Design a protein around this motif. Sequence first.
Motif, short mmCIF file in Angstrom:
data_model
loop_
_atom_site.label_atom_id
_atom_site.label_comp_id
_atom_site.label_asym_id
_atom_site.label_seq_id
_atom_site.Cartn_x
_atom_site.Cartn_y
_atom_site.Cartn_z
N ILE B 6 0.82 -1.15 0.03
CA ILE B 6 -0.04 -0.21 0.13
C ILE B 6 0.73 1.31 -0.05
N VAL B 7 0.93 2.07 -1.01
CA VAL B 7 1.56 3.21 -1.04
C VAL B 7 0.40 4.46 -0.74
N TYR B 8 0.83 4.89 0.36
CA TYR B 8 -0.12 5.70 1.12
C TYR B 8 0.25 7.07 1.20
N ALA B 9 -0.52 8.06 1.00
CA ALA B 9 -0.18 9.46 0.83
C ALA B 9 -0.99 10.32 1.62
N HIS B 10 -0.94 10.41 3.03
CA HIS B 10 -1.65 11.38 3.66
C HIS B 10 -0.96 11.90 4.98
N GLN B 11 -0.84 13.07 5.09
CA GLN B 11 -0.22 13.54 6.48
C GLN B 11 -0.71 13.21 7.67
N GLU B 12 -1.88 12.74 7.84
CA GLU B 12 -2.67 12.59 9.12
C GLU B 12 -3.22 11.27 9.32
N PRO B 13 -2.84 10.49 10.43
CA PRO B 13 -3.38 9.22 10.80
C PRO B 13 -4.65 8.97 11.07
N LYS B 14 -5.22 9.94 11.62
CA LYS B 14 -6.77 9.83 11.93
C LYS B 14 -7.59 10.42 10.93
N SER B 15 -6.95 10.74 9.66
CA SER B 15 -7.55 11.09 8.52
C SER B 15 -8.75 10.13 8.17
N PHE B 16 -9.42 10.43 7.45
CA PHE B 16 -10.27 9.45 6.48
C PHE B 16 -9.46 8.50 5.65
N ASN B 17 -8.52 9.23 5.12
CA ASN B 17 -7.48 8.31 4.16
C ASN B 17 -6.91 7.34 5.22
N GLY B 18 -6.34 7.80 6.29
CA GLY B 18 -5.73 6.76 7.23
C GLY B 18 -6.66 5.90 7.71
N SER B 19 -7.93 6.05 7.70
CA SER B 19 -8.91 4.97 8.20
C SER B 19 -8.85 3.85 6.83
N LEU B 20 -9.12 4.35 5.77
CA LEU B 20 -9.19 3.56 4.49
C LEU B 20 -7.93 2.40 4.58
N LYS B 21 -6.77 3.15 4.74
CA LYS B 21 -5.58 2.45 4.74
C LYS B 21 -5.49 1.29 5.89
N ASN B 22 -5.67 2.28 7.26
CA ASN B 22 -5.89 0.92 8.31
C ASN B 22 -6.49 -0.15 7.83
N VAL B 23 -7.82 0.11 7.51
CA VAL B 23 -8.65 -1.04 7.15
C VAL B 23 -8.23 -1.96 6.19
N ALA B 24 -7.73 -1.66 5.22
CA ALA B 24 -6.75 -2.33 4.41
C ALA B 24 -5.76 -3.29 4.98
N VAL B 25 -5.05 -2.43 5.83
CA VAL B 25 -3.86 -3.20 6.48
C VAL B 25 -4.57 -4.49 7.39
N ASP B 26 -5.66 -4.14 8.16
CA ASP B 26 -6.24 -5.00 8.94
C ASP B 26 -6.91 -6.16 8.24
N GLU B 27 -7.75 -5.87 7.13
CA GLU B 27 -8.44 -7.04 6.53
C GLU B 27 -7.25 -7.92 5.80
N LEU B 28 -6.43 -7.35 5.06
CA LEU B 28 -5.42 -8.14 4.40
C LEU B 28 -4.64 -8.95 5.30
N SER B 29 -4.22 -8.19 6.32
CA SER B 29 -3.44 -8.95 7.24
C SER B 29 -4.17 -9.98 7.82
N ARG B 30 -5.63 -10.05 8.29
CA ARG B 30 -6.24 -11.07 8.58
C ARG B 30 -6.50 -12.32 7.52
N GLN B 31 -6.48 -11.84 6.46
CA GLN B 31 -6.40 -12.96 5.28
C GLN B 31 -5.08 -13.79 5.30
N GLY B 32 -3.94 -13.08 5.82
CA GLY B 32 -2.72 -13.96 5.79
C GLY B 32 -1.96 -13.39 4.65
N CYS B 33 -2.34 -12.26 4.06
CA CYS B 33 -1.41 -11.54 3.10
C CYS B 33 -0.18 -11.10 3.93
N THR B 34 1.04 -10.92 3.05
CA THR B 34 2.01 -9.83 3.53
C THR B 34 1.75 -8.51 3.05
N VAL B 35 1.79 -7.70 4.15
CA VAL B 35 1.55 -6.31 3.86
C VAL B 35 2.51 -5.46 4.30
#
Lengths: 228, 228
Positions: B6-35
């Motif tokens: 995930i190439v992520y481009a936002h300055q703020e961890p609590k931003s809406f983008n930050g949440s979309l990124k976090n959700v991707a990490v969590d879901e893909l990580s849960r699937q067993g993917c290397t993230v």
Amino acid sequence: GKKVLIVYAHQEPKSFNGSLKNVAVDELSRQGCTVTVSDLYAMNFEPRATDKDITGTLSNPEVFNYGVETHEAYKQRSLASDITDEQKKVREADLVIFQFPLYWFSVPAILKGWMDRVLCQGFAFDIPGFYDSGLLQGKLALLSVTTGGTAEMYTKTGVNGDSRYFLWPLQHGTLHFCGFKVLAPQISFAPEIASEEERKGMVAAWSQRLQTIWKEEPIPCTAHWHFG
Amino acid sequence: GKKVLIVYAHQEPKSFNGSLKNVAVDELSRQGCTVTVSDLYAMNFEPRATDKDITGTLSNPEVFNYGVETHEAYKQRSLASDITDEQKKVREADLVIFQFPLYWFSVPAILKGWMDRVLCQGFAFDIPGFYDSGLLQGKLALLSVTTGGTAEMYTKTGVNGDSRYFLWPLQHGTLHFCGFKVLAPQISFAPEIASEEERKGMVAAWSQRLQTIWKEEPIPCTAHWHFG
Ligand SMILES: Cc1cc2nc3c(=O)[nH]c(=O)nc-3n(C[C@H](O)[C@H](O)[C@H](O)COP(=O)(O)OP(=O)(O)OC[C@H]3O[C@@H](n4cnc5c(N)ncnc54)[C@H](O)[C@@H]3O)c2cc1C
Ligand SMILES: Cc1cc2nc3c(=O)[nH]c(=O)nc-3n(C[C@H](O)[C@H](O)[C@H](O)COP(=O)(O)OP(=O)(O)OC[C@H]3O[C@@H](n4cnc5c(N)ncnc54)[C@H](O)[C@@H]3O)c2cc1C
Ligand SMILES: Cc1ccc(NC(=O)c2ccc(CN3CCN(C)CC3)cc2)cc1Nc1nccc(-c2cccnc2)n1
Ligand SMILES: Cc1ccc(NC(=O)c2ccc(CN3CCN(C)CC3)cc2)cc1Nc1nccc(-c2cccnc2)n1
Ligand SMILES: [Zn+2]
Ligand SMILES: [Zn+2]
């Protein structure tokens, strides 16, 4: 009298872009125009949109939103001096020329950062106050772009698509959004695989066009112009 | 097993983008993917394409051409380590997600610089070896974009034009050029003027879509798909 700002994005003074920039300076200077060049790479211009761009205290230290904070900073005269230096040049300019090689169907990142950081809300547009009512209305803008791909690759039936397709984010999404009237783009295709005489000809075409740039009509910056 | 970058481009961890990124990490990580996440702003990622990107001696000290010198540097393993770090992540990845807010109908400059600097000739494409024969063939890419403007503004008859129009340089000119198969973009419109429950819903839509991302077919990345 007219003021011109050339926002120039190339690393190499002897490059083909460098020659196109130099020609513009020479011709416009000869016409009596006031000319400024922002040589982004020479300036080591900062492309990243970060909280360092706001020199005042943030409105909200829990959650940083770049657009919100730069809009408020602009109102409060609290933007970093590299941004306000560029805003002064743009505010005074009658014509802004962007001179750049095409990178990934768009501007080089250092120039993308000048768009991102310089054209903030309150300065370049407001809500309301965009497209025809954008805050840079009364100014002209023109893209002078060079490519790797050939003219024929940049047609509807070529692999790259019509060159007007890639112009849309720059001409409509950015320039027209800020209220610029947009002059027809200057596209110098594939200088690297052209002959030295061909490169010479493309340079002279640019110089010649600039002799009467102030007589040109802007293009209709619409979905139809770009994709019709 | 699958690798995701995930190439992520936002300055703020609590931003809406930050949440979309976090959700991707969590879901893909849960699937067993290397993230792996390249958090560009956290990395203070360098966006400018300069001669500092080549750690070997230039082929030509009279005239610097970024594309030529990075192509030769790539062949000679003489690129700066921040670039080759990203190339390693991309080389190993099966899926690359770009997570970003739309800036001027395109990517934020820091992410534009990651495209400009990371996807060099010899690595991401060659001549020949682009579009369907690009060197990243066999990989999937997906743009997850957030906007200021509303869905209705991003239609053919809205002021911004169809959202597919701005996708063209990224999807066709960049991803498809490098040989990626392109998954349908995830566009989260106007989170800032949506309600907190609406933002919650757009986040959950993304999380849900990722549960079956590996079952999706790529889009036909053509002029027709974008402008038809
Ligand atoms: C990261 C990246 C992304 C790219 N993405 C794209 C893309 O999406 N699409 C695409 O089509 N291309 C792309 N390219 C190619 C890029 O657009 C070209 O390499 C660029 O436009 C060439 O211009 P230049 O000024 O660098 O040419 P130069 O290399 O400088 O020009 C060629 C030669 O002309 C010489 N010259 C200088 N002045 C003159 C003169 N007055 N008369 C005669 N000769 C002169 C120069 O010294 C040089 O040796 C990309 C390149 C890079 C690095
Ligand atoms: C330089 C620049 C250029 C721009 N160009 C364009 C353009 O060309 N076109 C266009 O349309 N727009 C443009 N914009 C607008 C930009 O695209 C938006 O501001 C951006 O997409 C918003 O996303 P965000 O993550 O920053 O939202 P945020 O502000 O972070 O989201 C809104 C709120 O949601 C909160 N939130 C976080 N997570 C959740 C959650 N899980 N559930 C509920 N709420 C949550 C956040 O904390 C925040 O307070 C531009 C902006 C800038 C700065
Ligand atoms: C730095 C440079 C200089 C020139 C080019 N040229 C072209 O990409 C190109 C590709 C194919 C042809 C086709 N031509 C067919 C005939 N034979 C004789 C020559 C090849 C012409 C130009 C690319 C680059 N570098 C570069 N770097 C990153 C992205 C791109 C890029 C991206 C999208 C579309 N086109 C190019 N290009
Ligand atoms: C950081 C931010 C957050 C939101 C927005 N929003 C919009 O640009 C927008 C504009 C008009 C409407 C129309 N709407 C009509 C109804 N009333 C109630 C609300 C306004 C909606 C969203 C912009 C920004 N900042 C920003 N900064 C630079 C460029 C742009 C930009 C560029 C091109 C097209 N759209 C936006 N946008
Ligand atoms: Zn327009
Ligand atoms: Zn395509």
